[PDB]
Structure formats: C-alpha cells, structure tokens
C-alpha cells in the first residue's frame, strides 16, 4: 500500500485534590513514537523519542513546547466544561482523550485526516472525513459542536491536516527513511507441546517484525480455524519490533493437517508453515 500516518495522542486526566489535570501527549509516525510531552515532568518540554527527530533545531522544540502548554490549558478548560455538560460533581476524576493527524499515500498526497475526542473512554465528538463538519455523540457534544461551528474550528483543523500535517510527515519520512520506510519481516517458527495423550498445542510464532500489522492464521485441511485459534494481541518487543502468536489444540496424530499462514508487508510472499518434528 506504501501509505504512512502521523498521529498525536493526548490524554488529560483530572485528579481532584491532587492538582491540575495531568496532560500527556505522544506523537507517532506509523508504529514508531517520536516525541512526548508530560505536564508532570520537572521542566515540561517536548522531548525526542526516536533518533531521527533529534536533528530538529531549538526553535522546533521551543515552539512545540509552547503548543503543548497551550493544549494542556485548553484541555483543562474542556474538562471543566464537560463536567458541567454531564452534571457531574467536582469530586470524581475524568479523562479527555484526543487523536488527530493525517494519512498519506506513497506519493505524499493526503488520503485522509482525523481529529476526534473521547470523554471517559466514550467517543464524544469527531471531525468528519470531509474535514468540514462534525459528528457529536450526544446532547453534551452538540454544545461543543455548536461552539466549534460558530468559531469555524473545522476550517482551521482542515488547514493543519492538509498543510502542516502532510508537509511535516513527509519530512519525517524522508529524515527517518532507513527505519520508517523499512519493513522488517517476521521470523517464524512452529512449536508443538503435547497437552495429553490425545491432544497437542501447535503454536505459530512471528518475531522481530515491523510494522505491527500482521495476519497469522491456522488452517485445518485448508479451512480457517477462526473459532478454535487462540490469538494473542500483537505486542512490542521494546526494540521497535513486534511479536505475535496463534495457537490451536489439535488431535495427536493429525498435526500434518494443520498449516500456519503468515502475511506481512516485509515478506516477498506469504508463508505457509507446518510443524516439522526434528
């Protein structure tokens, strides 16, 4: 597909009796985090979290720092107003989350932009794909919608998503190309563990891959075993790569009827693996 995304993920959490709401922002290109900001840090500043962003000059870090400090203040006002929109007491903790950013194709052109929010883990309001209109979840989010229509917020969000977001993402891709535009294929193997005299687990492993998107399936006589496959969530290894496994319990003696199928961007072609007892 050759596509890429940039996302910023903000979390604001109120804590009555324990100060002002904490603000945390992290920024990603695809599955790679590259910046953070945390209002509880000793001297809150945007900080680098990937090597290829370190080259940006002091004006970058200074300007972005001022932006996050403004965003925290805006989120604190938002939290106060949300409490009122839901008739909530001032004693409980609440959470405001924001996602925004852009997706581009191989040619660098905008595929889609995003700007949306959740309150207490529930979708609240979202900029529509047109980057002009809003979808509100309920009557509280309709108040936000009215305010943001009157202030022409969507026009500004569109300008960022079509302009700055795309342009900076292209720069990041070009500065981090050796990693950001490199798919590392999974290293794969199948293990076998008897569970009883009559059954064994076959586990299909994928290790060391980037980006995180992968499909691991088991087939029995070429039929997908969707309902009988234990699949773990794809998980970070801590060295930029991801891991995943898929397991099926099979009748002893029938192992050879099972195949593990692996698809990933980094592979020249999809893999079919079987248990090979050495």
């Amino acid at each position: 597909m050759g596509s890429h995304s940039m996302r910023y993920f903000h979390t604001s959490v109120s804590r009555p009796g324990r100060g002002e709401p904490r603000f945390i922002s992290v920024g990603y290109v695809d599955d790679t985090q590259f910046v953070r900001f945390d209002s509880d840090a000793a001297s809150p500043r945007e900080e680098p979290r990937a090597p290829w962003i370190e080259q940006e000059g002091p004006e970058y870090w200074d300007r972005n720092t001022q932006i996050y400090k403004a965003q925290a203040q805006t989120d604190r006002e938002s939290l106060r107003n949300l409490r009122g929109y839901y008739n909530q007491s001032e004693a409980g903790s609440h959470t405001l989350q924001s996602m925004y950013g852009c997706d581009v194709g191989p040619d660098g052109r905008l595929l889609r932009g995003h700007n949306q929010y959740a309150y207490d883990g529930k979708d609240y309001i979202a900029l529509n794909e047109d980057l002009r209109s809003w979808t509100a979840a309920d009557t509280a989010a309709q108040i936000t919608q009215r305010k943001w229509e009157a202030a022409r917020v969507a026009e500004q969000d569109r300008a960022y998503l079509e302009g700055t977001c795309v342009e900076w993402l292209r720069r990041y891709l070009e500065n981090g190309k050796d990693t950001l535009e490199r798919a590392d294929p999974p290293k794969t193997h199948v293990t076998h563990h008897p569970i009883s005299d009559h059954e064994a687990t076959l586990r299909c492993w994928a290790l060391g891959f980037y980006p995180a998107e992968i499909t691991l399936t088991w087939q029995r006589d070429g039929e997908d075993q969707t309902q009988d496959t234990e699949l773990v969530e794809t998980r970070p290894a801590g060295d930029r790569t991801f891991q995943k496994w898929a397991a099926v319990v099979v009748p002893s003696g029938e192992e050879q009827r099972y195949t593990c199928h692996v698809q990933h961007e980094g592979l020249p072609k999809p893999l079919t693996l079987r248990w090979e007892p050495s």
Partner: peptide, 9 residues
Amino acid sequence: RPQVPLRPM
C-alpha cells in the same frame, strides 16, 4: 509537529 489548539469543548 503538533497543531495549535483552538477552542475548548
């Protein structure tokens, strides 16, 4: 780079 905030909720 992040977007300048605009209006609270």
